[PDB]
């Protein structure tokens, strides 16, 4: 009953951010402290809870959300942010309780001719609600003439590829993100530390 964190962090395959992956963590003990100092993580930020203290808490459920963005967008994965990621792809609530973990994956997620497998939502009408996952591929209507599912002028496919080349500036390189959320319900607690 150790927590299946290696399934999240060492997953061979990561979701595009618009289609962000969610994993329920339940019925185990989580040793966060080995992660907190791993130093392979360029980001480890906690909100509403304290790191160096995580191993002493108990929670009803833990969700691990994971996806790929470019390193320059990692600041958007935090409460109260704006930008194309926070507004249209992955949105944390103001009262978020959890931790954001990120790390450069240029060696895995970047291809010599460019890797175009990872995508984000560019065109959307309004902002996502917190923890909303929009996987629509409807043609986006920029004018008043409806599109009838054809692309064209004022009629744009709403998703775009990042284009990760190994020559990219570090801000435009792929990063993998894991977001842990700590749900404290009115039920018995299932994830705790040592």
């Amino acid at each position, epitope marked *: 009953n150790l927590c299946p964190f290696g399934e999240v962090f060492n997953a061979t395959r990561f979701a595009s951010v618009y289609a962000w992956n969610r994993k329920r963590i339940s019925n185990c003990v989580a040793d966060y402290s080995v992660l907190y100092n791993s130093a392979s993580f360029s980001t480890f930020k906690c909100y509403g809870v304290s790191p160096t203290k995580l191993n002493d808490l108990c929670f009803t459920n833990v969700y691990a959300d994971s996806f790929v963005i470019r390193g*320059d*967008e990692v600041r958007q994965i935090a409460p109260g942010q*704006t*930008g*194309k990621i926070a*507004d*249209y792809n992955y949105k944390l609530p103001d009262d978020f309780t959890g931790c954001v973990i990120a790390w450069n994956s240029n060696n895995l997620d970047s291809k010599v001719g*460019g890797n175009y497998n990872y995508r*984000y939502r*560019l*065109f*959307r*009408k*309004s*902002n996502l609600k917190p923890f909303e996952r929009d996987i629509s591929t409807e043609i986006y*209507q*920029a*004018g*008043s003439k409806p599109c009838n599912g054809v692309e064209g*002028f*004022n009629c*744009y496919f709403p998703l*775009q590829s990042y*284009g*990760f*080349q190994p*020559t*990219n*500036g570090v*801000g*435009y390189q792929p990063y993998r993100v894991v977001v842990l959320s700590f749900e404290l319900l009115h039920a018995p607690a299932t994830v705790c530390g040592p």
Partner: antibody
Amino acid sequence: EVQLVESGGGLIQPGGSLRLSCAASGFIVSRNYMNWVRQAPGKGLEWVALIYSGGSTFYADSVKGRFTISRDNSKNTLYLQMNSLRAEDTAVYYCARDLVVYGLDYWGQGTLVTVSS
Amino acid sequence: AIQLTQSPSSLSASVGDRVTITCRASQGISSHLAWYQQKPGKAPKLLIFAASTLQSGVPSRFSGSGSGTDFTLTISSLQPEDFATYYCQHLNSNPPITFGQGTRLEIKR
């Protein structure tokens, strides 16, 4: 028959205030990324402000805290409120529709703002 | 963050010549670059986006290429109406966008 029609430019005393307008036809401003770009006389293009359809706004450092970009959906119009104008703000101001990965495809004709006493 | 530097800063060439302007990005921006043409008194006009896609309506004698840090705009057979200043832009999907400083093109005759 897409067009963006700007107005509101002209002469303004240093430290004064001014509002530019951009009236669009051929697309819906509240559904698009929109920018103001400016060009000082004889110089290059400088990005000024950006509004998202979702409502988020962003600004060049050189205008942060002085300018406000907004829109009126009913009039299909984009605005640029400029306060505390200084001489370095003298420029032709363009509005443009932004297809972010596809470039800035439609621009207004420009409105010259002269900050002078 | 990204500086874009155009080269040369100005240039002259005769009708029918093949002209090439370069834009150099201080870091790899991978293919997120557009080219604009500005005629005196007019707004810039989009020519190329994603570094090589011709904007609709633009004459096919205009073409672009490159990726990473080094990009080029090419006019295959120069025409008198191609007198302009040409700008490259970083197609940044987050803000800041930036522009190069411009390349002035005049016709020799």
